[PDB]
Amino acid sequence: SMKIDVVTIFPEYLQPVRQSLPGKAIDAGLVDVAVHDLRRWTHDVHKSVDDSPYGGGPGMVMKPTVWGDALDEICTSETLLVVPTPAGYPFTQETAWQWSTEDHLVIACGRYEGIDQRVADDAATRMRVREVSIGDYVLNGGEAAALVIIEAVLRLVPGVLSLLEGPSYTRPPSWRGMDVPPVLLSGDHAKIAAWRAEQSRQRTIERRPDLLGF
């Protein structure tokens, strides 16, 4: 059974919710998710987790001594350490598939300005480390990115459940002046597949022209 440890300064934000796909996976015994308050590994009364960046600049950088202790305790040699960061390699469906068969994911959630690079560099000498971005936008921290990664990965674990997908329809056949495309009701399943391919092509050209090569 997969183990996922999430380390964050926002533990209640990342607490699993029963009424959700990860909540369902947990209650099904298909994953164990544990959320850890990073402050647990702080050294001082202020529970300090970041510090000013060397070289100057706005924002803060998360402390290596704090993260170092947290990961020392939580990780083992089998761990895949996931570090969400907008400077990461792209997280894709392929990645989600790879991680879905891992025994132990640890997701280190930090502010977007980053965790001191030595944490990942050190960790990588003992375990596999993956710095990943979930998209071309900036979140204040990796917390919401962790939620996305967990959702994408867990729905691929057995038992939990190119081109763009085109429009989909269901009952009633007519609604507010709009009819479901009659081909879908034709019982000509080869034709339906061809029609769906064309819908997919048109939607991809319109919304994601990057996916068509060219």
Ligand X SMILES: Nc1ncnc2[nH]cnc12
**Stretch 67-126 residues interacting with a copy of itself (CB under 8 A):** 68, 86-93, 95-96, 113-114, 116-118, 121-122
Minimal distance, residue 86 CB to a copy of itself, in Å: 7
With contacts defined by CB under 8 A, name the span among 26-34, 38-46, 74-82, 184-192 that binds a copy of itself.
184-192
Say whether residue 105 binds ligand X (CB under 6 A).
no
Supply the DSSP symbol for 185.
Answer: G
Binding of a copy of itself at residue 207 (CB under 8 A)? yes
Q: State which of positions 134-153 bind ligand X (CB under 6 A).
A: 134-135, 137-139, 141-142, 145
Cβ neighbours around 78 below 10 Å, total: 11
Q: Counting every residue, how long is the chain?
A: 214
Contact partner at residue 180 from a copy of itself, ligand X, none, CB < 5 to 8 Å by partner kind: a copy of itself
- Measured CA to CA, the distance from residue 136 to residue 121 in angstroms comes to 24
CB of 73 to a copy of itself, least distance (A): 15
Using CB atoms within 10 Å of the CB of residue 120, give its burial: 0 to 12 exposed, 13 to 18 middle, 19+ buried. buried
The structure tokens listed for 119 are 């944490």
- Three-class SS of residue 133? strand
Q: What's at 129, amino acid-wise?
A: V
Ligand-binding annotation for 90, yes or no, is no
Judged by DSSP in three states, 183 sits in: helix
Q: Residues 60, 112, 183, 200: which binds ligand X (CB under 6 A)?
A: 112
Q: Which of 27, 128, 175, 212 binds a copy of itself (CB under 8 A)?
A: 175
Residue of 15, 70, 13, 68 whose CA lies nearest to 40: 70
Binding site for ligand X (CB under 6 A): 84-86, 88, 112, 133-135, 137-139, 141-142, 145
> Which residue ranges are tagged as binding site?
84, 110, 133-139
